[PDB]
């Protein structure tokens, strides 16, 4: 990230071995589970593009996924160039934000300018866009296949439903009319009848309590 | 969280890897035991709404609970909007950090007078966590050791539940998880609690 030195100059603070190891381990242990995306974002708080590239490079497996990610990154960089024609410092182009044609010092200059040109945050946005695609792709189930079954508690079924909906779906804000109705429809008849009796506008709190 | 520069300016202090991991681990190990509430509040000291969202979003399992929490949050945001008509002032989703930027949140939180959006949002979150603790409250037959719950924490819950409600201790062993159960069974009958806890330490 960025830090200020004894001479007052803004300089790079190298990313920490604790952060690197935490990141490498999350990926080893959780692969492209949906919760890896918030985790990557938090671990990369205040990263320059160089730092972001450092983090992406430490992934050892998943080379197909990492290639797909490069593709998405190049697509966003091209869209940036399309929307930002080039006529303080010089203006960053797409590949500069992605850190492949920009120097660390230039990145620091952009990020710490007044007003700041947040190339670290812009690049992170592109990366998470690509990561989300991968999370979606690696989801092996369709919400539809999540049905309650025989002697599974309602709570466990809701757990699986929203876990799956976080995967085959981009992110965690889900909960449409569609999803509530699907949620009820895929419960077993006992619960379904209880929930239907609840009337529309039932909270998930009320739904879980009723079926407890 | 938030910190001031020597140049006077309020800036963001990134949430630490140690804090992030501690949170994720507490949830993995303790599920929705009541002591999750104090611990969350400690871990989130001085948090901006962005940080609070980071903490909630890094939770991977327990998606029923996390969905309920979103529901409670949206309810409090709507109640905020009901009591704070807008004529800048933060709206509900701004306090919940979904429609406000970090810089805006920092501005509100460090203004004079402060609009403590971090504290307001934390209040909503703990309200929702409390609902979950209440929901997952087992009333003794429904106290069974969790997958990755430390044995000590499980025994705490077991005797706390017995408190609210070889007889109970039989059930204690029976309701322990497979890994610990194997260890305890090998211990032989008449093992003291100290011995059991050391064994599964």
UniProtKB/Swiss-Prot annotation, chain A:
Localization of this protein: Virion
Post-translational modification summary for this protein: Phosphorylated possibly by host MAPK1; this phosphorylation is necessary for Pin1-mediated virion uncoating.
Effect of residue 86 to A: 2.7-fold decrease of PPIA-binding affinity
Superkingdom of origin organism: Viruses
Sites of Phosphoserine modification: 16
Region ranges (Dimerization/Multimerization of capsid protein p24): 138-212
Region (Interaction with host PPIA/CYPA and NUP153): 57-88
Effect on the protein of changing residue 87 to A/Q: 8-fold decrease of PPIA-binding affinity
Functional description taken from the UniProt entry: Forms the conical core that encapsulates the genomic RNA-nucleocapsid complex in the virion. Most core are conical, with only 7% tubular. The core is constituted by capsid protein hexamer subunits. The core is disassembled soon after virion entry. The capsid promotes immune invasion by cloaking viral DNA from CGAS detection. Host restriction factors such as host TRIM5-alpha or TRIMCyp bind retroviral capsids and cause premature capsid disassembly, leading to blocks in reverse transcription. Capsid restriction by TRIM5 is one of the factors which restricts HIV-1 to the human species.
Assembly, per entry: Homodimer; the homodimer further multimerizes as homohexamers or homopentamers. Interacts with host NUP98. Interacts with host PPIA/CYPA; this interaction stabilizes the capsid. Interacts with host NUP153. Interacts with host PDZD8; this interaction stabilizes the capsid. Interacts with host TRIM5; this interaction destabilizes the capsid. Interacts with host CPSF6. Interacts with host NONO; the interaction is weak.
Name of the protein in question: Capsid protein p24
């Amino acid at each position: 990230p960025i830090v200020q030195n004894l001479q007052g100059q803004m300089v790079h603070q190298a990313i920490s071995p604790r952060t690197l190891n935490a990141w490498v381990k999350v990926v080893e242990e959780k692969a492209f589970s949906p919760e890896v995306i918030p985790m990557f974002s938090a671990l990369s708080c205040g990263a320059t593009p160089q730092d972001l590239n450092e983090m992406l490079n430490t992934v050892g497996g998943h080379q197909a996924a990492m290639q797909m990610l490069k593709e998405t990154i190049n697509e966003e960089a091209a869209e940036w160039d399309r929307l930002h024609p080039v006529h303080q410092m010089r203006e960053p182009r797409g590949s500069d934000i992605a850190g492949t044609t920009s120097t660390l010092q230039e990145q620091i200059g952009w990020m710490t300018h007044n007003p700041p040109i947040p190339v670290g945050e812009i690049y992170k946005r592109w990366i998470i866009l690509g990561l989300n695609k991968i999370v979606r792709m690696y989801s092996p189930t369709s919400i539809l296949d999540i049905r309650q079954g025989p002697k599974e508690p309602f709570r466990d079924y809701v757990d699986r439903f929203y876990k799956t909906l976080r995967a085959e779906q981009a992110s965690q804000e889900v909960k449409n009319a569609a999803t509530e109705t699907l949620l009820v429809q895929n419960a077993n008849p006992d619960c379904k009848t209880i929930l239907k009796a609840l009337g529309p506008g039932a909270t998930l709190e009320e739904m879980m309590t009723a079926c407890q």
